[PDB]
Amino acid sequence: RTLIVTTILEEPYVMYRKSDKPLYGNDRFEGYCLDLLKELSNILGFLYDVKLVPDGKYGAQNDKGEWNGMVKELIDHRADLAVAPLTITYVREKVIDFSKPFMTLGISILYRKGTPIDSADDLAKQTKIEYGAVRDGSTMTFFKKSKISTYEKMWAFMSSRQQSALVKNSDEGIQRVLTTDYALLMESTSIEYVTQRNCNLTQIGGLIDSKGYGVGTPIGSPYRDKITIAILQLQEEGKLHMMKEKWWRGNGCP
Amino acid sequence: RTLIVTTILEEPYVMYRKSDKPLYGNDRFEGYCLDLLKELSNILGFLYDVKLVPDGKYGAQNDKGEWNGMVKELIDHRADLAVAPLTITYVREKVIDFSKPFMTLGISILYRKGTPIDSADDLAKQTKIEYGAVRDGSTMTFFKKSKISTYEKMWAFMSSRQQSALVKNSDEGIQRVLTTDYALLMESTSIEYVTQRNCNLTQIGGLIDSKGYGVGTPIGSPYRDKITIAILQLQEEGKLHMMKEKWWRGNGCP
Ligand SMILES: C=C(C)[C@H]1CN[C@H](C(=O)O)[C@H]1CC(=O)O
Ligand SMILES: C=C(C)[C@H]1CN[C@H](C(=O)O)[C@H]1CC(=O)O
Ligand SMILES: [Cl-]
Ligand SMILES: [Cl-]
Ligand SMILES: [Cl-]
Ligand SMILES: [Cl-]
Ligand SMILES: [Rb+]
Ligand SMILES: [Rb+]
Ligand SMILES: [Rb+]
Ligand SMILES: [Rb+]
Ligand SMILES: [Rb+]
Ligand SMILES: [Rb+]
């Protein structure tokens, strides 16, 4: 009846609220994922306790196949749900359950406006403009695993020189795009958020692939199917679209 | 044991193959969904028999609350899987299990080229151009249930005059668009297929909602999650993308 929820700070999904005094408990947070959790809890009738994931990671596997991050929290039954922009992937689905997606997206490219670059193949065929992705995220894993020649070429480039083209987190990637001649391979929903707020950046090309974010649960959880039904309800009533517009829309671009 | 797969003829998902002699068994069929089934068969290691759904319906509930179509075939355990452009909806997910989506799409508008109509609100604020949907499909249901004012208005129009603006199937809708002053509310992936083949037709506006097609299984089926993992594998390898290109590409229209 009180669910323990693992999450991670990531704009505009989960952010610290602004207050004149110190904040405690669920009141520390706002964002799209908090709104989602409120809606799910209303539909399904549960209380919840939001806990930042202690290692600050989403969930990836090492060499020994051991997991970290929110994925490992679910595997170890230290949380009932993970509510975050947690990409639904083949490797994660083998070890946890996800609801159906509450948002659909794809990898694309964040770069500057008004350049000759139109596609990933435009990046793949040159070496002057650097490009990469968040290290150990689902986008990086996409490239590492791809057998498409263009994407193999890109992976060879990203992984060269001790992964100097990769970044630790999205904000580092964004600053690298704004300052240097660098393109970031980034989930398209994050790109939309960014380009609403940085009028000199743009998405280049379309989506390279198609995937979703889902609510994570331990394998076998009874909540996964209940949360899926609740998500479908919210989408069909237009609520998920309204929640996206609320958190994404910026102050406009000239 | 060989799995029974329920499906329905719908271009370019499931179509009768062309041959000079009578065809039998799985050899009767080709199309995107047959390709998908072959790939799922090869990942998961099952044999399968494809069976057309006897009532030729996808799955809707009547006034008594009784289901029909492929949804009912699963409910009654007369099929193990349904592989078709079967829309993942709140009402259906209550009664069957769907894999995660193999295709994402949304409702949009099919109409003639060259007109000043640009959106669903352009339709809704007028009476001269007729518009509708396939009766008892998930698109009609979206309009029937919507509490958004524009879609409420459009539903009043569609349901008027004993639903004369509605059509029994997509081909009837397409011919009505081609011949009369009529717009069809249709799933975007089917709009994409139709406009690559009839050059006088176009999509009007973008996608009014977001949803997916998934493989249906009876509640409780062990195949549901195994099929989800296989779909994620196929997506991440670029196979689903290649299969869509194979079946959608038209070579005749500007
Ligand atoms: C914000 C980041 C590190 C997360 C968000 N979804 C992806 C994941 O769930 O792995 C990561 C982004 C990416 O890999 O581009
Ligand atoms: C071809 C039709 C009758 C199917 C395809 N998906 C929807 C379904 O699964 O309900 C229907 C289309 C629609 O309602 O626009
Ligand atoms: Cl915390
Ligand atoms: Cl699922
Ligand atoms: Cl033949
Ligand atoms: Cl048959
Ligand atoms: Rb403060
Ligand atoms: Rb799973
Ligand atoms: Rb290759
Ligand atoms: Rb700059
Ligand atoms: Rb279900
Ligand atoms: Rb138009």
User: What structural domains and CATH numbers belong to chain B?
Assistant: 1-105+211-254 (3.40.190.10), 106-210 (3.40.190.10)
Ligand number nearest CA of B99 is 4
- The nearest alpha carbon in chain A to B234 belongs to A90
Contacts of B71 (CB under 8 A, 6+ apart): B58, B59, B60, B82, B86, B92, B95, B96, B216
- Within 6 Å (CB) of ligand 1, which residues are found? A 10, 58, 85-87, 133-134, 137-139, 170, 186-187
Angle (CA) B137-B143-B146 rounded to 5° is: 130
Q: Is A55 on the interface with B (CB under 8 A)?
A: no
Q: Kindly state the tokens that stand for A155.
A: 């992976």
Q: Which residue has the tokens 């329905």?
A: B8
Q: A24 Cβ partners below 8 Å, 6+ apart? A: none
Q: At what resolution in Å was this solved? A: 1.8
Looking at the CA of B190, which ligand is closest? Answer: 2
> A204 to chain B, minimum CA–CA distance in Å?
19
Residue B169: which region, alpha, beta or left (left: phi > 0; alpha: psi -120 to 50)?
Answer: beta
Task: Output the CA–CA distances (angstroms, integers) from residue A162 to A31, A135, A139, in the order listed.
Answer: 35, 11, 18
DSSP line for A150-162: HHHHHHHHHHHHH
Q: Is B165 exposed, middle or buried (0-12, 13-18, 19+ CB in 10 A)?
A: buried
Q: Crossing angle of helices A223-236/A32-44, nearest 10°?
A: 110
Q: Tell me the C-alpha to C-alpha distance, in Å, between residue A249 and each of A86, A192, A237.
A: 22, 9, 20
What is the amino acid identity at position B31? G
Distance in angstroms (rounded) separating the CA atoms of residues B121 and B154: 9
Give the number of beta-carbon pairs within 8 Å between A and B: 70
Q: Please name which of B178, B203, B179 lies closest in space to residue B190, comparing C-alpha atoms.
A: B203
Cα B110 from Cα B204, distance rounded (Å): 6
Identify each DSSP E strand in chain A by its residue range.
2-7, 15-16, 29-30, 47-52, 81-82, 96-98, 103-105, 107-112, 130-132, 182-187, 201-204, 211-213, 216-218
What is the spatial distance between Cα A15 and Cα A13, in angstroms, rounded to a whole number? 7
Chain A partners of B94 at a C-beta cutoff of 8 Å?
Answer: 229
H or E segment and range at residue B72 = helix B69-75
- Answer for the pair B107, B186: CB distance below 8 angstroms, yes or no: yes
Nearest to B234 by CA among B87, B43, B32: B43
Q: Which of B86, B148, B228, B232 best tests the A interface by mutation, with the highest count of A CBs <10 A?
A: B232
Please report, in range form, the residues annotated as the binding site of B: 85, 87, 92, 138-139, 187
Nearest CA to ligand 2 atom 11: B137
Q: Contact B247/B31 with Cβ under 8 angstroms?
A: yes
Alpha carbon of B45 to ligand 5 centroid (Å): 26
Residue B90 to residue A236, Cβ atoms within 8 A: yes
Q: Is A224 exposed, middle or buried (0-12, 13-18, 19+ CB in 10 A)?
A: buried
CB burial of residue B235 (10 Å; 0-12, 13-18, 19+): buried
CA distance B149 to B152: 5
List all residues 6 or more positions away from A64 whose beta carbon is below 8 Å from its beta carbon: none
Reading the block at residue A89, the tokens are 């992937």
SS3 content of chain B, % helix, strand, coil (to 5): 40, 20, 40
B58 Cβ partners below 8 Å, 6+ apart?
Answer: B8, B69, B70, B71, B84, B86, B87, B137, B138
The method recorded for this entry reads X-ray
Output the CA angle A228-A58-A61, nearest 5 degrees: 110
Q: Give the distance from CA A194 to its chain's centroid.
A: 13
**Is A189 annotated to bind ligand?**
no
* Amino acid identity at B173: G
Q: Which among B100, B233, B238 is the nearest to A148, CB-wise?
A: B238
Residue B203 is inside which H or E element, if any? strand B201-204
Q: Which residue has the tokens 């009846």?
A: A1
Contact A71, A138 (CB under 8 A): no
Instruction: Report whether A77 contacts A83 (CB < 8 A).
Output: no
Direct distance between the N- and C-terminal alpha carbons of chain B, in angstroms, rounded to an integer: 48
Contact B57, B68 (CB under 8 A): yes
For B104, which of A94, A97, A104 is closest by C-beta distance? Answer: A104
H/E run at residue B216: strand B216-218
Please compute Rg for chain A using Cα positions.
Answer: 19
Beta bridge partners of A132: A184
In one-letter notation, the amino acid at residue A127 is T
Question: Are residues A109 and A158 in contact, defined by beta-carbon separation less than 8 angstroms?
Answer: no
